[PDB]
Amino acid sequence: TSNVITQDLPIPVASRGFADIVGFGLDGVVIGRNAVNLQPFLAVKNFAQNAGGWLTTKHVRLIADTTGTGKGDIVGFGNAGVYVSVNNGKNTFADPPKMVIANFGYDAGGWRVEKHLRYLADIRKTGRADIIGFGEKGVLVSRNNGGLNFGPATLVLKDFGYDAGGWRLDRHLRFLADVTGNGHLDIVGFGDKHVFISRNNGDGTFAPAKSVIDNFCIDAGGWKIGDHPRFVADLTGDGTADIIGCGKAGCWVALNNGGGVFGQVKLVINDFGTDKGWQAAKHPRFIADLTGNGRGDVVGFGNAGVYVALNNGDGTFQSAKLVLKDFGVQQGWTVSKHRRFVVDLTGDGCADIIGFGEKETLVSYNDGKGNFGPVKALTNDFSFSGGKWAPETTVCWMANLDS
């Protein structure tokens, strides 16, 4: 398994553990701790549409451990900078939050959701998350120096920027993933003609980009942003991140075989591709371990419901099959109104299914083998409801509040 950060899933969730619900709703942050008696509570009256003036169009809202206690904190990139509400480890979050650095904000540094990416990750393997942003002139890192002291925002690499050179959210992808196995997140960029790796130097800097694959890109295979989603994930169990994507004809995989260098692209699954009806606008696909393997499996929310193809263990896959007649288009699920995730909720290393639906937060549990049990309702909260939880003005994530 690898700890991986993408654009669509910027909060890493443990392959084996009990994912918690974090909702940035209209009136504040609402926590649904994974627990025997689920009870959402308004934890912080901030970070919200109607409390603090937070907008999905201008701001980024996340969870990460900023103090090192192993407890996840609320983190938001607002106007004047980054704001942190600390988790005190006794189920209470600081309110009001503290502004921890005057950078990475809409007014401080001119960060834009339409041009730039902002991530939180422990890239120095020190137990706290640093701030890393793919900004204008390239990658800017701010080191987390303990007790909410964030060092200067610093240009550590003159690449992968909107203006260094030409990186666009409508053409390219930029992820963090350990492609070498040293436990440090490296940079993976899908550019125009090459997947590039920028290795992690261990000290908050990354080395210059090196081309590793001549596929999976807008001008190298014809891979378009929405239509052909791409992923980084350990598909072999060697602890290093491989590459997999859903094309036209199905799922192509490039296996990592040199601690950061890649084998040739192969079609491993005859499905999940546009050729079989899969559409950016309708059918989210994911990579998750559904078998406790340490290897990633393919999960797709299709028309009739949930499809899955299981990794044998070596990056080859069993045929796709329907495992659950729910959470698909048939049952009213839409990308505009609802959220779906594939995360372990039961600590068995076998990812489960959670959907924030029309009126209910629904779930189906992995039987521990990649099959799923009946759809159960967790709570009325976090659902679209009118929508009190519209994606336009709210944000829901799964996250392990205990690391």
Next chain:
Amino acid sequence: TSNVITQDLPIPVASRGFADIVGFGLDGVVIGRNAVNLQPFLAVKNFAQNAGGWLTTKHVRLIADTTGTGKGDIVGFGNAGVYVSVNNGKNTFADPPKMVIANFGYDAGGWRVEKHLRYLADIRKTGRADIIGFGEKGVLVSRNNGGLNFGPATLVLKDFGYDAGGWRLDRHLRFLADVTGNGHLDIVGFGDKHVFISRNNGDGTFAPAKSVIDNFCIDAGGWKIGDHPRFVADLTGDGTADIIGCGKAGCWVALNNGGGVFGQVKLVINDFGTDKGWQAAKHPRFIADLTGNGRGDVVGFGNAGVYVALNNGDGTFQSAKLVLKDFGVQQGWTVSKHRRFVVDLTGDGCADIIGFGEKETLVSYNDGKGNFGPVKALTNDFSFSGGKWAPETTVCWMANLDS
């Protein structure tokens, strides 16, 4: 609130948090992680009646953080010494476990459940647990030197031991509690004629015993082990442990000044004592914060049900009253078959009620003011299920696996 270690409750549980179930069953350690879909899993095939030859009459089985990751490990004092299964932070524990010191065991130092006490505590406040034993010649300490290296068992104090001067499990009480207010756990011992305290110096050693109270003892006020239970708990909210006991006429307390000097011994509740029918054999009593204000409240499982008396905040109390018609003698609950605990299950700092009954593990939830809702079944698991979970051959504890 003050973290405390007692003979009945050697494992500290968070007053605000989500306590997990840990059962040392017939076939191994069964983990019951506090989560939305409680799914007990056989975590380690050891530490058990029929896996490792672990017997309730010879051995001690606990949960403590022995590595400093904040994740509770499985620790057991067996025949040849102390064995640990490390918790890796992803809900898996090493199996088999490994021996970390050939001492403090039935055949390694002649340790006896009938004569000695063995505890795991972070007495040096270094983030991981030392081994503390009250043995033959006094208090033996083994320093957790990291990475499962443990220093030689060293006699740190010639007192509180079976042969120094004559401490007896049928006459006396030995607890760990921070009474002095310096954040370190002190030895609190109820001897013949006095309650003694031994100040934790901070370095792995303990100052000589000092008499602080002429009461609460077998030869000071007529306090008997079975019939008149005693506790240490923060009753005033200053983070400093006070003393409270269920006597004949009710509950008596002596309050801590904040630095280990104790005030008068006074009667604060007219109930919970032998005079009102409370018996060692039938009616377990606890101190837990049922209102989330950081001061301990009294809870007793009597004949008709659960009785409670609420702390005003300063060691004075409201009247006792019955809050729930269950978990009592009349409903079949017996010490010989069943387990009852009062712990926060929901993260609101208000202790809830959980009982391992004849056929089910049942729960009643605190409403946040010390009242309790309808009784719900959490699972068939961990219940007596005759006699899959008999107390003669199995051990159930509550604990916070994630700290």
